[PDB]
Amino acid sequence: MLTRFLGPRYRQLARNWVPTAQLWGAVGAVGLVWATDWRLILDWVPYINGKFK
Amino acid sequence: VSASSRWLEGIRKWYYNAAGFNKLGLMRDDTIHENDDVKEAIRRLPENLYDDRVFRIKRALDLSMRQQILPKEQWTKYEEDKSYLEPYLKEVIRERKEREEWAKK
Amino acid sequence: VAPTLTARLYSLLFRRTSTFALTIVVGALFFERAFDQGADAIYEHINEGKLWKHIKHKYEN
Amino acid sequence: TATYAQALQSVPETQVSQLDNGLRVASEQSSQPTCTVGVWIDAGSRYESEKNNGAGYFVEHLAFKGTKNRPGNALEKEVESMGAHLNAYSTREHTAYYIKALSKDLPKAVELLADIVQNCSLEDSQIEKERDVILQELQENDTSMRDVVFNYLHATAFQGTPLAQSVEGPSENVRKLSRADLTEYLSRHYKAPRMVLAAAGGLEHRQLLDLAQKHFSGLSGTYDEDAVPTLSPCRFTGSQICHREDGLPLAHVAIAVEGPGWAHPDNVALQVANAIIGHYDCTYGGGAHLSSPLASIAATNKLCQSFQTFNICYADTGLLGAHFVCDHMSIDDMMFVLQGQWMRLCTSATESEVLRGKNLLRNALVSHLDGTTPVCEDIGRSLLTYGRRIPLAEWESRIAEVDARVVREVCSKYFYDQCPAVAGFGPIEQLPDYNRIRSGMFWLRF
Amino acid sequence: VPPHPQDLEFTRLPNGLVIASLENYAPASRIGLFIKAGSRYENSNNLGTSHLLRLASSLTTKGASSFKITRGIEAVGGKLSVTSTRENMAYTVECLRDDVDILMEFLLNVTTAPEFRRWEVAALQPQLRIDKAVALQNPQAHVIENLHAAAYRNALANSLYCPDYRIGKVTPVELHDYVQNHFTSARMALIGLGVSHPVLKQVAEQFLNIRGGLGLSGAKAKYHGGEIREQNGDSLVHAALVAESAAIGSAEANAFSVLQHVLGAGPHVKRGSNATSSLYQAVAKGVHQPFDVSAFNASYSDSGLFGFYTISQAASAGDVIKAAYNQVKTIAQGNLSNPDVQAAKNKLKAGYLMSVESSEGFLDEVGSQALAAGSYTPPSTVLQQIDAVADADVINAAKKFVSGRKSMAASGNLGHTPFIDEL
C-alpha cells in the first residue's frame, strides 16, 4: 500500500535529494575510515602513509 | 445465490458468533480499531448514532470489567447488525485517496 | 587571490552543509597526521634522551 | 475560438515616440471610450538628501492646488466639470500624476497635466496649509501597523543609504521645508529626459504626439548640462528592528533578503516561487485544502490572520520576502513555517508546484492589465525602468522557461544562507532572536 | 492598430434564463452566473442563509469534492468568487482561455449540485462571525445595514450579514431549500467574457435547466421609514438620511442619479476642495474642520433609497446634517442651474463609462442588467437616457426627497445628532 509514494513528484523529490544523500555517504565513509584508521582503505591515500609499508 | 452462498453466509455467521462481540451487546463497527480515517468517521456521525455508539462501548467496557456477559436474548444478532460506520469510513478513505493522488503529480 | 579566496571556500564548499561536513572530515584526517608528526618532532627536539639510543643495543639481534 | 497563446499576440503593440526634449511619449490604443493619461517621473525619495526628505511628497500636496494659468481651485473645477478624475502617487523611486477621463477630453487632459507638471504655483499660504495636512497624515500613517513595518524594514535593510528613507519624510522636515527647497527639487528632477507622458484607450498615437509637442515643448531643450547626477547604489544591510509594543493586539513582522533590481531577468523565477508560497488571509474560503503549504498549515493551525509574499524592486536592489500578522503566541511557529518553505524551494522544489506558480503568475499579469488605468501606469513605469514596454508575449516566454530546476537555483541564490532584514512591531516578545532567524536561512539536512 | 471589436450576443431561453457573451480577444476568461437570490429573499425564519451560502462556495459538490475545487482551480491559477447584494448573488469564475472548461464545470457544480454536508457546514459556521467582524470594521456597513432595517419592513430590510443569533444555527436543509427555490432558470443569467455564445448556450441548455422555485423579484419591499440609532463613542459620527425614491430601470431613477451628481458623490481630485460638490460646499461654509458628505443613492427592483451620508465630529453632527438637508431643499425650491445639471450629467456619464472599462466592471453590469431588465443596453443608449433627464426632473426628484417620509441610521456619540423630528 506504499503506492502512495509512487508518482512524478516523488520521482522529482528523490532526484533533488540524491547529490545530498550521496555526499552524506561520502561524509559517513571518510568519517568511518578516519575514525577506525581503516588500514585497507587508508593505505591508498597519497599522504597519511603513517603505517610505512 | 443457492447452497454455496448460504454456506459462506453460515460460515460468516459462525465466525460472528465465535467472535463474541455480540455477547457484550456490541455491534461490529463498535469494535473497529481507531486510526485517523476511523477517528474522522466517528466525528462525522450524526448525534443519535454517536450517542448510541458511546452507550454500547460503555455497556461493553462495564461488562468486560466484571467479566460478565449479556443474557442470550440481548446479544446482537448477526445481520440485524447495522454497519452504521461503513458509509462514513468509506467516504473518508475516498477523500484521503484523492488527496494522495493529487500528491503524486 | 585574497577577497576571492575565502569567497571560493564558501562557494565551493561551505554553502551546502554536505560539503561543509565532508571538508571538515577530509580536513580532520590530514590535520591529524600533520599535527601529530609536527608535534612529535617538537617533543623530539626539546629532548633526545629516549630511543635515539636504540641504534646501539639493537641491530645485534 | 482563439487560444491563450494566440490572444497574447493580438494585444496592440505599445507605440513609443521621443520629443526634442527627452520627453518620451508612449501609448497603447484600444477601443474604449475612456482613457487614462499621465506623466511618470524618475523622481522619488531615493533621490533626496536627508534635510530635503519629504520634498516630493510635499510637491504632491501642492500639485493640484493651483498653477499660474489656473489659480487656487480653478483646475479642480475643470477636471470635475468634464467628469474626469485626477490622481497622483509617489514611491521611493517614482512620482506620477494621471488623469482618468473620457477619450474626447484627451486634449484638455494633456494640457492640464502639462500645466501641473511645469507651471506649478507653490504659493506661500498654500505651502503653509499643507504642512498641517501632511503632519496629520503622518499621525494617521502611524496607526497603520503595516505601513509602519515596511518603513521600518526599509530603514533597517537600507541603513545609511537614501533608500532607508520613507517617502513622506520626518516630521522635522515637514515643518521646515521652504518654498526654495521645493522649487530647487522641482528644478533638479522635473525635467524632460526623466519624464514619460503615458496614455491608454481610445486615442491615436499621433494625437498624443501632437499634444506632447504642443504642451510639453519648453522643458529640457535649453536646460540640462551640469548638475544632473545619477543614482548611487544602496548597500543592503541585513539586520533587525524590533518595536515592542504590547498594547497593540496583533504582531506585524516583515522579513526579506536582498533582491536584485528591476532590470534583472531573474525576477520572473522569484515571482513564480513567491506565487507558490502565495498569500493568506482569514477571509479566504478554503482553509485546509489550499495548495500552498504555508497557507494550508496557517489556516488549520490558525497561525496567523494574514500573510503575503513580496518582491519589491528598486534600481539595482530590492526586498524579497514575506510579511505577516498574528497573535503574540504564533510568531515563532509562523516564522518556522515561512523559512521552512523558502528552504524547501531552495533545495527540493518540485515540478507540479512550479506550473501552479507559473499559472498564478500568468493570471496575475493579465488580470492586472485590465482597464486604461493600470495599463497607462504600466507603460509609464516600464519606460522609466526598462526603457521598453515589455509585451505580454515576452513575459509569457520568460514565465514558460521557468521549471523546478530554475526555481531551486534562483531561490538558492537569493535565500540560501543569506542575512535577512527583519522588522517587527506590536507584541513581539516571541519574535525569534536574530541568530535563530539567521540559522533558519540554511539547512543542516542539505 | 487595435482589432475591430465584436458585439455582445444576448439570448433569452424559453425557460427564462438569459445568456450573454462577448468575445474580446483576451488572454483570460470570465464567466459569471448571476442569480436573483440576494438577502431580500430571506425571511424571519431563515435570516443569514444567503450569507452562509455565500461563504460555502467551496464545500463538496456531486462531481467535485472541496479538496478538488480548491486544488483544481488553484492548479490553473484561477478564481472563484461569490458576490452578493440585497437582490442578487453572483458566482464569478476567472482563468486563462485554455482553461474555461474545467472552471465552468466547477461553477456548475457549486451552483447546481452542492451537497451541503452536515459536518462541512458545521465547520463553516464560525466563518460568519470572522466574515461579519471584518465587514463591520467600516462604520459604513453598520449604518447602511441599519438604514435598510429602518427603511423597510420587509425584504430589503434584511441584512447582507447573518444576524448574530443565527450564527451557528443555519442548517444544511435551509441551504438546500434556498438553492432549490432561488437558483432556478427563470431567476438566472449566464454571462461570459472571452468565451463563445454557442458554448455558453450549450452549457445553459445542458446544465442550467432547473426550475421549480419561486417566481418574480419579491414579496415586494414595503417602504416604511423610521430611524435606528447606535451609541458608540468613535469621535466621528456617521449618519445617513434617506427617503424613498425610484426603482431601477424607470426614467425617474436616472433623475435621481443626476441629482446625486448635482449634489456630490465621491471625489475627483486627490486632496481636493471638491468645488463642484453642492453638498460639500454647503456644509463647509458653516462647519470648520473634519467632515465628509456625499449623496447616497440606492436603487432596487421595486424601490429606491436616495439622500445623503455624513461623517463628522460628534458635536458638529447636527450642523452638518442640517446644512446638508438645507442644500437639497434649495434645489427642491428651484435653485438649480443648467450648467450644473450639465456638469452632473458629465460626471455621471464619464463614471459609468469608467465603470465598465474593465472585465470585472463590464461583466457585473451585464449580469445585473440581465437580471433587472432581461436586456442588454449599450453604453450609447444609456448615455442617451441620461441626456433625456431634464432640469425639472432633477428638481422633481429633490422635491420628492424633501417631502417623503424619511429613514435614518446613525452611529457614534449621538449626543448632538438630530432625530428626524428635528430636521
Query: How many Cβ pairs within 8 Å bridge chains A and C?
Result: 32
> Which residues 6+ apart lie within 8 Å of D310 measured at CB?
D256, D274, D319, D320, D321, D322, D323
Angle, helix D179-189 to helix D124-141, in steps of 10 degrees = 80
Residue closest to D383 by CA, chosen among D125, D194, D143, D173: D194
Q: Is A7 helix (H, G, I), strand (E, B) or coil?
A: coil
Q: Inspect the interface and report whether the beta carbons of D408 and A20 lie closer than 8 Å.
A: no
Q: How far is B95 from chain A (nearest CA, A)?
A: 14
**Strand partners of residue D24:** D18, D196
Assigned CATH for E1-211: 3.30.830.10
**A9 touches D at CB < 8 Å:** yes
Chain D residues lying within 8 Å of A22, measured CB to CB: none
Give the span between the Cα atoms of B99 and B103, in whole angstroms: 6
DSSP readout, D315-363? SS-EEEEEEEEE-GGGHHHHHHHHHHHHHHHHHH--HHHHHHHHHHHHH
Q: What technique was this entry resolved by?
A: X-ray
What domains lie within chain C, and their CATH numbers?
1-61 (1.20.5.260)
Give the span between the Cα atoms of E13 and E210, in whole angstroms: 12
Residue closest to A47 by CA, chosen among E143, D33, E383, C34: C34
**E120 touches D at CB < 8 Å:** no
What is the helix (H) or strand (E) element at residue E32, kind and residue range?
strand E28-35
Give the span between the Cα atoms of E299 and E249, in whole angstroms: 9
Scanning every residue of chain D, which has its alpha carbon at the shortest distance from the alpha carbon of C21?
D444
Q: Inspect the interface and report whether the beta carbons of A4 and B100 lie closer than 8 Å.
A: yes
Residue closest to D107 by CA, chosen among D5, D208, D206: D208
Q: How far is E78 from chain D (nearest CA, A)?
A: 7
Chain B residues lying within 8 Å of A6, measured CB to CB: 104
Q: How far is D414 from chain C (nearest CA, A)?
A: 13
Q: How far is C15 from chain A (nearest CA, A)?
A: 12
Give the span between the Cα atoms of E277 and E346, in whole angstroms: 13
Intrachain domains E1-211 and E223-423 with the same fold: yes
Phi-psi map region of E381: left, alpha, beta (phi>0 left; psi -120 to 50 alpha): alpha
Give the span between the Cα atoms of D332 and D329, in whole angstroms: 7
* Residue D222 CA to its chain's centroid (Å): 32
Resolution (angstroms) stands at 2.6
Residue closest to D321 by CA, chosen among D437, D400, D168: D437
Phi-psi map region of E371: left, alpha, beta (phi>0 left; psi -120 to 50 alpha): alpha
Q: Inspect the interface and report whether the beta carbons of C15 and D416 lie closer than 8 Å.
A: yes
- Cell numbers 441548455: residue: E205
**B99 touches E at CB < 8 Å:** yes
Chain A residues lying within 8 Å of C32, measured CB to CB: 34
Residue closest to E288 by CA, chosen among E255, E327, E319: E319
- Cell numbers 485517496: residue: B97
Chain A residues lying within 8 Å of D408, measured CB to CB: 16
Residue closest to D324 by CA, chosen among D316, D332, D315, D314: D332
* Residue D380 · residue D96 · CB < 8 Å: yes
State the burial class of residue B39 (Cβ atoms within 10 Å of its Cβ: 0-12, 13-18, 19+).
exposed
Angle, helix D74-81 to helix D106-118, in steps of 10 degrees = 160
**Strand partners of residue D15:** D27
Q: Measured between alpha carbons, how far is residue D356 from residues D399, E72, E294 in Å?
A: 11, 10, 44
- With DSSP H G I counted as helix, E B as strand and the rest as coil, what are the percentages for chain C, rounded to 5? 70, 0, 30
Interior CA angle at E375 toward E372 and E379, to 5°? 100
Q: Inspect the interface and report whether the beta carbons of E2 and D392 lie closer than 8 Å.
A: no
**Strand partners of residue E295:** E308
Give the span between the Cα atoms of D143 and D150, in whole angstroms: 13
Q: Do chains B and A touch (3 or more CB pairs under 8 A)?
A: yes
For domain D239-442, the CATH superfamily is Metalloenzyme, LuxS/M16 peptidase-like (3.30.830.10)
User: Which residues of chain C are at the A interface, by a Cβ-Cβ cutoff of 8 Å?
Assistant: 16, 18-19, 21-22, 25-26, 28-30, 32-33, 36-37
Residue closest to E17 by CA, chosen among E179, E180, E202, E188: E188
Q: How far is A1 from chain D (nearest CA, A)?
A: 23
Q: Inspect the interface and report whether the beta carbons of D133 and E359 lie closer than 8 Å.
A: no
Neighbouring C-beta atoms of residue B9, cutoff 10 Å: 12
Phi-psi map region of E226: left, alpha, beta (phi>0 left; psi -120 to 50 alpha): left
Among the listed residues D13, D48, D50, D60, the single catalytic one is D60
Neighbouring C-beta atoms of residue B11, cutoff 10 Å: 10
Grid coordinates standing for E389? 433627464
Query: How many Cβ pairs within 8 Å bridge chains D and E?
Result: 158
Q: Inspect the interface and report whether the beta carbons of C17 and D416 lie closer than 8 Å.
A: no
Half-sphere exposure of E175 (CA within 13 A, CB side): 26
Grid coordinates standing for D189? 528632477
Q: Measured between alpha carbons, how far is residue A2 from residues A5, A6, C22 in Å?
A: 6, 8, 33
Chain A residues lying within 8 Å of C22, measured CB to CB: 23, 26-27, 30
Give the span between the Cα atoms of E316 and D408, in whole angstroms: 60
For domain D14-228, the CATH superfamily is Metalloenzyme, LuxS/M16 peptidase-like (3.30.830.10)
In the 3-class helix/strand/coil scheme, how is C11-38 assigned residue by residue?
A: HHHHCCHHHHHHHHHHHHHHHHHHHHHH
Question: Residue D45 has what DSSP assignment?
Answer: S
Of A26, A48, A50, the CB nearest to C22: A26
Grid coordinates standing for E174? 435551509
> Which residues 6+ apart lie within 8 Å of C29 measured at CB?
A30, A33, A34, A48
* Residue E31 · residue E195 · CB < 8 Å: yes
The dihedral over CA atoms of D399, D339, D409, D267, expressed in degrees to the nearest 10, equals 40
Q: Measured between alpha carbons, how far is residue E15 from residues A24, D195, E11, E89, E215 in Å?
A: 70, 58, 11, 20, 12
Q: Inspect the interface and report whether the beta carbons of D442 and C17 lie closer than 8 Å.
A: yes
Give the span between the Cα atoms of E181 and E53, in whole angstroms: 13
Give the span between the Cα atoms of D117 and D128, in whole angstroms: 20
Give the span between the Cα atoms of D273 and D349, in whole angstroms: 9
Residue in A12, A13, A20 to test binding to D, most D beta-carbons within 10 Å:
A12
- Cell numbers 534583472: residue: D264
* H-type alpha helices, D142-226: 145-157, 171-176, 179-189, 205-216
Give the span between the Cα atoms of E400 and E306, in whole angstroms: 10
Q: Which sign does the torsion angle of CA C1, C4, C10, C11 carry?
A: negative
Give the span between the Cα atoms of E411 and E142, in whole angstroms: 8
What domains lie within chain A, and their CATH numbers?
1-53 (1.20.5.220)
Q: Measured between alpha carbons, how far is residue B89 from residues B86, E21, E414 in Å?
A: 5, 44, 57
Scanning every residue of chain E, which has its alpha carbon at the shortest distance from the alpha carbon of B105?
E75
What is the helix (H) or strand (E) element at residue D235, kind and residue range?
none
Domain ranges of chain D: 14-228, 239-442
Determine how β-strand D85-90 pairs with β-strand D195-201.
unpaired
- With DSSP H G I counted as helix, E B as strand and the rest as coil, what are the percentages for chain E, rounded to 5? 45, 20, 35
* Residue B41 · residue B85 · CB < 8 Å: yes
Determine how β-strand D306-313 pairs with β-strand E9-12.
unpaired
* Residue D325 · residue D250 · CB < 8 Å: yes
Give the span between the Cα atoms of E366 and E83, in whole angstroms: 15
- According to CATH, the topology of domain B1-105 is Cytochrome Bc1 Complex; Chain F (1.10.1090)
Question: Residue E51 has what DSSP assignment?
Answer: H
> Which residues 6+ apart lie within 8 Å of E398 measured at CB?
E259, E328, E329, E331, E332, E336
**E266 touches D at CB < 8 Å:** no
Is D60 designated active site?
Answer: yes
**A24 touches D at CB < 8 Å:** no
Per-window interface: D 336-365 vs A, CB < 8 A: 347-352
Chain E residues lying within 8 Å of B102, measured CB to CB: 67, 71
**A20 touches C at CB < 8 Å:** yes
DSSP readout, E188-224? EEEEEESS-HHHHHHHHHHH-----S--SS-S---B-
Q: Inspect the interface and report whether the beta carbons of C18 and A50 lie closer than 8 Å.
A: no
Q: How far is E281 from chain D (nearest CA, A)?
A: 13
Residues across chain A: 53
Spelled out in words, what is the top-level CATH class assigned to the domain E223-423?
alpha beta
> Which residues 6+ apart lie within 8 Å of A23 measured at CB?
C16, C18, C19, C22
Q: Do chains C and E touch (3 or more CB pairs under 8 A)?
A: no
Q: Do chains E and A touch (3 or more CB pairs under 8 A)?
A: no
Residue closest to D436 by CA, chosen among D288, D335, D291, D315: D335
Per-window interface: D 407-446 vs C, CB < 8 A: 416-417, 442-446
DSSP readout, E385-413? HHHH--HHHHHHHHHHHHHSPEEEEEEE-
* Residue E203 CA to its chain's centroid (Å): 27
Grid coordinates standing for E342? 450639465
> Which residues 6+ apart lie within 8 Å of E372 measured at CB?
E248, E249, E301
- Cell numbers 495599463: residue: D375
Q: Inspect the interface and report whether the beta carbons of E119 and B95 lie closer than 8 Å.
A: no
Chain D residues lying within 8 Å of E2, measured CB to CB: 12, 29-31
